[PDB]
Design a protein around this ligand. Structure first.
Ligand SMILES: c1ccc(-c2ccccc2)cc1
Ligand SMILES: c1ccc(-c2ccccc2)cc1
Ligand code: FES
Ligand code: FES
Ligand code: FES
Ligand SMILES: [Fe+2]
Ligand SMILES: [Fe+2]
Ligand SMILES: [Fe+2]
Lengths: 180, 432, 430, 181, 182, 433
């Protein structure tokens, strides 16, 4: 996947702010389980992808991430995300009932200027703290790469792509009942 | 010390009873390493994982780290990933291609066969042919690679027995055969392997009731809900004559498969020239592959698959209280591009750690093992009586011992075979 | 297996010596769960935790997930949170109200009584035969206890002569007590016997060095430790049978004031509510209004401080760990100002962040860590304090009584501990 | 219940966003360097400092996740009770924190909301609190904080009128909460 | 040789400048988390001092002794030349600790900016959590603060590093090594 | 239960085989604490760690925490960091100066000697103070280094060290001013058995001269130089103790090792000039070419390891069969120039610490070894330790004692034989030399 190609023309403070604020707004939605409103932020052409990651020798570094013809943790369009939302809000979805207590701590937000006006590629680091039941604690760290198109919504933006690069080979958690 | 009598009391296949200590006891686990895992045929993957010379895959046999590697002569060798000098790991990556294997500690060099070829300062300071990593027996069944430490254990074909026709449902549909989609998803569940081994062996009962109500809802059209989606009922359950293998499937009910795999995969599986060629190839026992929808199977002890969905996995034990799930997806090598892609999409969507079906699976398993820390939770036996005395060996539709889909005869036999493996020291009595 | 004679070698009450291995040994803990915890009466909470039909509280009976739930006929039966099919947890949430309990694994349905009412595809073995294992339920003035053993003596017989000492906390009004909303839980990496024994016999820690900072916290900002009065007067109780014990101060008002504050100290010592409590417990002949800083342990893991009114259960969790489950009791008719004071002061002092509790736990943690070493488990620990000075002829308090700074109740707790896993049958354990 | 933070339609100016984020970074620097008296000075005399107990509930009962204003809590504090805790943590004879822990308060997700009173702002934020002590003990906490901050001529720019911490834990995995959130 | 609360300026840094420093750290985190060691090493000025003191358990009164001094052993105490060799090691395919490489995440927050006696030079305080995952199941989590001296530079990040001190929240290191950069 | 017959069948020095179960078995470890650690001489630190009256260092002997504290009579006492009332820790900081120690639980008070001097309410309750409080350890010093042992029947440090002594003097007795520790004690956790670490510094020059440190050498060599241009030393010798499990290895006449690690200035100080030749005269009784000795390792059984050229020294603290703690520090000559001290300090941080370009790689190997041993087949067959077997001889002109080639495992076999000997033989009448 390589180093995020940040724009050398450092993004405007005005926009830098509303992009970060959007993510914080989005984080607030996810941790408070407002799934209906969080889904609405995803455009029709959305690609929700989270590849597998492997231990590779330096000489075989290009094969670290699973490809677009491989299995992955997540590889979702619009109708596939829709299905997950139906489950995650469901009363008979017992992986999230009782609900988990989660924290989406978000920083390292980089917004990228493209040629298209009102479209900006966005990188972010995250730590996701998952506590559930009595004593289960799952800690996740990684990055999220997004496109983001300027919209007239409550959060100010819509998501048309999300790639989650997780910092794990074998997943130390029993499941991924949460959203990243 | 666990006496042979004590083991036999842990499983009662006649009364359909289960002593809950088998999921929790520490000393029973360490015996499992020897008695079960140290002499069973264990899934390491598919031939397509290691398609060329020198291609390797670091995997496990129980808790033993192993290297599976394709040779010059197109054979697959499996050896212990352990420098016999001071125990260092010889192969330190997950997967790739090697011309050699070198120990990072003191520089002992190995060939792809696992033969020791070079020792630094050997002339200045014993036979290399005697000091290579320990080798395992390697056998394949229609694409799947199995391995075994015990030279005295039966071969793979005899090990499987009449469970082979149900394996064939997934593996033998076309002469071109199966090929793995790239990627080996791995996650850790704090539950014992037997819970998961059992589920795919016998427990269709969980999918047709409550566990997968939400995953079904994810694979149903937005305009439609859970009421307007019958809850499969009719179907069968198979037990292998020896080995504690078991399968289960629905008959004439596409609702279970349609939800999971969509319209296009179902059409490929049940209709057209491909599904006809599949039934053509499997006419050796006269079983209709068109009518068998949403199958589940476990090959003892830790291999599990879902022929219709085409997901396959190994449960790696890590003590009484945790396992590592290593899973991949299979497709017919000749299938169309759209069919293969739909297989890939729908497997990621449904059976990975974040899969709308698989999420609920672990959630149940985690909770059981947690409760099993209790003394009273380990005091009274568990129930495994479903389908007791409702199966015979003679059906014009299915070969071997066949009962109702929501039975637990296959489960009883799995624990029965486990019980036998734990208690019988010599293969002179264990073998069929 | 530990031989019954080797078990008797661990605790010697006559010499006043303890074997450190009792706090660390893994195999002794396994015996504990079966012998000690599987036949004792254990606190699951208060009747107010579930006052209406269908109201439940998921709690523990030493590693056993257990669920306690109110019934239509006002009963509150407790069963295993385990589905005998394949062992899945029946009730998934901590608390709430249920109409029926449905297992998420295969859909075995249950009423609120625990009885198996629906099995999916059962027509394709009795339903009444395969329900979760029911425990014995017995209450003591709001306190709900449970026990797996049918051979075990009833609650009243079990508690015995230490009932008047519970009556100090639970029977001051005819209205009864009510548990304040909320139950706090936290993990301490120490053995349960450190926590049980301290509340049973250790006032010596509070009278010396452990709570110097906690005293400082409850004292006025202009006042420091040099102005705080050091308490030296009081006694120590030992139960006749059960593994119970107590210690308290006599004539030291300043000790309670530093912990609970003015309004609660007043409420406990002076006025209509405080005097009504002296006449209701008058039959015991105990000077209840001069009693301050009392600590108590109902064996094995039920501990509380009367006056302060914090109450907790210590949960087994292995030889090197516990889970503390604490809530607070207030009298039902108590003023709205007093209830708010009792709430605030319990949070201030005896919680995971509590200014007393912090230092209690810190001792135990560092002790358990040290016991990892071989030599640290080799020599005996001193448990002599007040050796043979506890005579039974004191004119003020009933039972076996000594000086407050002694370890007589400690030896009574370990004696019964030893006994409750060296004696198999109840025919001798009485 | 608490639920999602009601964030204002117009984002706070880049000056105000900076000021409040900088406040939290400063507060964290005080706590992480054990400047307890300096930290205590931020608390207004009418402070309410609150950390409710959190329980596992089914969807049919989502309203009862957090404990109420009349329930026990991890913290429920006034200016006076908070100062008692400061006395204990700064005491040479406070064994829980002498030797002291080593903590890091990582602060993010800062959302600023205006009030009806000028110079007063309601703030939502996320934290991870990493606590290391003794030789090898590590406790990691995560959650959200809901504050009322008043502009102040102090060292940090604001004083704390109210604080609610929602902790992502049922049973506390840590043996104590000797830290301030 | 002690450390206390960072001495932030009473006048908070300009919003434009605050953002530039924040973004620079996000970019630095990107280079390291993607193993672009050469590009990261290019950020280090010739007069770099890279310091991570030992940290010990002390009584409140002995507080001034918590950290190791400039004539004591440390976890890191580096110059340009010593950092060069470390970069040479981590990029080497016979450098076993990082071949196969670790998977790291540097999460950066709490950025506090202070001007110095030199124009376009800034004393910077920040907090971090470093999550390191390697091999199959190995997880090491570090938290701490960094005290930086940054200089404006004509590179693709906007700044260069003249000094770095890392205060790590650990006495005994809970990781088997420190093969990563902070 | 492990029988003495079974314990002897774990190690065989004749065949040169090692049973891998010695590094993994939980019940074998529980015996190690009793039979090895509770009876061995263990490093605690240096005399310069506790210089003035009341100075203390909180450390370990096995899993048992101890306080090492300088007495008013200028001696040094070691006692168990545990109050014999209810087991509380008596000394609660890493290091410092104490006038007295006081238990925080119930306030039992102790003097700097570790004696119980005050018991609160000792008149209202209670018993003699002189008889209670923490178990004491035997203390012995060796040219700056401080050692300790619990067992009263064990041999004295001098007899314990025996033939290994002269090989320590290469680091310790360079000047009449003696050695002083640089400030700082680095501490870190490695999930591996202690025997791997102990063996490496005992006998394993073989890892340094082959693959482990190819990247470490690359880090220290001139930036213009490449690995193939760098030249690995090949000549040198190894030592096995007459008794104990001790051993040392070193290169001769090839400074390539030392130069890459320590740099030119330090290499000059060690080999050329007024101070380097003064050391040669002081070690005149041994008759060793100390100036030609470049790049040396040594382990004092069981846990005291050090590199006389680099001057790093450490104790391996056991934490179960699958874990250790490394507690490491650095020594310098008391009168060595300011630039030389600063170079010793900088190069030790650079190479031999948790982040050290050398140490990073040693703890990569040991960690991956331990993981493997969780599997059944991984513990089923013996490991190989046969290098230089029947090749080491006692009558060497250049060096005193049993000497072999630099790439041997004679010290390795000698260490594991004494492990077997301690694990099997219950009484000292049999074990003592
Ligand atoms: C065990 C595991 C999965 C299934 C299964 C689930 C959905 C559709 C088809 C089979 C049955 C038993
Ligand atoms: C054991 C430990 C370290 C070394 C060593 C490392 C670098 C240079 C010379 C020797 C040899 C054996
Ligand atoms: S361990 Fe492989 S060569 Fe020494
Ligand atoms: S476990 Fe409760 S229904 Fe299967
Ligand atoms: S523990 Fe040291 S006196 Fe009580
Ligand atoms: Fe399932
Ligand atoms: Fe206390
Ligand atoms: Fe090394």
């Amino acid at each position: 996947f390589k180093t995020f190609e940040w724009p050398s023309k450092a993004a405007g403070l005005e926009l830098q702010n509303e992009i970060e604020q959007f993510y914080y707004r989005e984080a607030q939605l996810l941790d408070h389980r407002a799934y209906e409103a969080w889904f609405a932020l995803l455009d029709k052409d959305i690609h929700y992808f989270m590849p597998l990651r492997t231990n590779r020798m330096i000489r075989e570094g290009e094969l670290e991430y699973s490809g677009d013809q491989d299995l992955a943790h997540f590889d979702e369009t619009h109708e596939t995300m829709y299905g997950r939302i139906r489950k995650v809000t469901s009363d008979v979805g017992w992986a999230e009932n009782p609900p988990s207590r989660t924290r989406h701590l978000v920083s390292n937000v980089i917004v990228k200027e493209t040629a298209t006006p009102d479209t900006f590629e966005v990188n972010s680091a995250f730590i996701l703290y998952r506590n559930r039941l009595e004593r289960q604690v799952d800690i996740f760290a990684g990055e999220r790469r997004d496109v983001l198109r300027r919209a007239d919504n409550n959060l100010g933006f819509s998501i048309a792509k999300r790639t989650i690069l997780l910092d794990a080979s074998t997943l130390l958690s029993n499941n991924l009942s949460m959203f990243f | 010390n666990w006496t042979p009598e004590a083991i036999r009391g842990l499983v009662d296949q006649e009364k359909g009873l289960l002593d809950p200590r088998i999921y929790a006891d520490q000393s029973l686990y360490e015996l499992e390493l020897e008695r079960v895992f140290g002499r069973s045929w264990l899934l390491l993957g598919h031939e397509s994982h290691v398609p060329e010379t020198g291609d390797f895959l670091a995997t496990y046999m129980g808790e033993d780290p192993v290297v599976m590697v394709r040779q010059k002569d197109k054979s697959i060798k499996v050896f212990l990933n352990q420098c016999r000098h001071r125990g260092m790991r010889i192969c330190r990556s997950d997967a790739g291609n090697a011309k050699a294997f070198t120990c990072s500690y003191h520089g002992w060099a190995y060939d792809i066969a696992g033969k020791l070829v070079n020792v630094p300062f050997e002339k200045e300071a014993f036979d290399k042919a005697e000091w290579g990593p320990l080798q395992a027996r390697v056998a394949t069944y229609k694409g799947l690679v199995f391995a075994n430490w015990d030279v005295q254990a039966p071969d793979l074909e005899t090990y499987l027995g009449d469970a082979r026709p149900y394996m064939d449902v997934m593996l033998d549909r076309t002469p071109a055969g199966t090929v793995a989609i790239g990627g080996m998803q791995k996650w850790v569940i704090p539950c014992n392997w037997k819970f998961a081994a059992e589920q795919f062996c016998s427990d269709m009962y969980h999918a047709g009731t409550t566990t997968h109500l939400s995953g079904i809802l994810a694979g149903i059209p937005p305009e439609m809900d859970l009421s307007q989606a019958q809850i499969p009922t009719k179907g069968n359950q198979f037990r292998a004559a020896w080995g504690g293998h078991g399968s289960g499937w629905y008959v004439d009910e596409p609702g279970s498969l349609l939800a999971v795999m969509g319209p296009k995969v179902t059409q490929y599986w049940t209709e057209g020239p491909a599904a006809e060629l599949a039934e053509q190839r499997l006419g050796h026992t006269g079983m209709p592959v068109r009518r068998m929808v949403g199958q589940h199977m476990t090959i003892f002890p830790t291999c599990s698959f879902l022929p219709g969905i085409n997901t396959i996995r190994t449960w790696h034990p890590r003590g009484p209280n945790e396992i590592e799930v290593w899973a991949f997806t299979l497709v017919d090598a000749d299938a169309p591009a759209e069919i293969k892609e739909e297989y890939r999409r729908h497997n990621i969507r449904n059976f990975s750690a974040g899969g709308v079906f698989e999420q609920d699976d672990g959630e149940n398993w985690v909770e059981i093992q947690k409760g099993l820390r209790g003394y009273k939770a380990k005091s009274q036996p568990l129930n495994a009586q479903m389908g007791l005395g409702r199966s015979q060996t003679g059906h014009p539709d299915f070969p071997g011992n066949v009962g109702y889909v929501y039975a637990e005869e296959a489960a009883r036999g799995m624990y029965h075979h486990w019980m036998r493996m734990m208690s019988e020291p010599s293969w002179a009595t264990l073998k069929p």
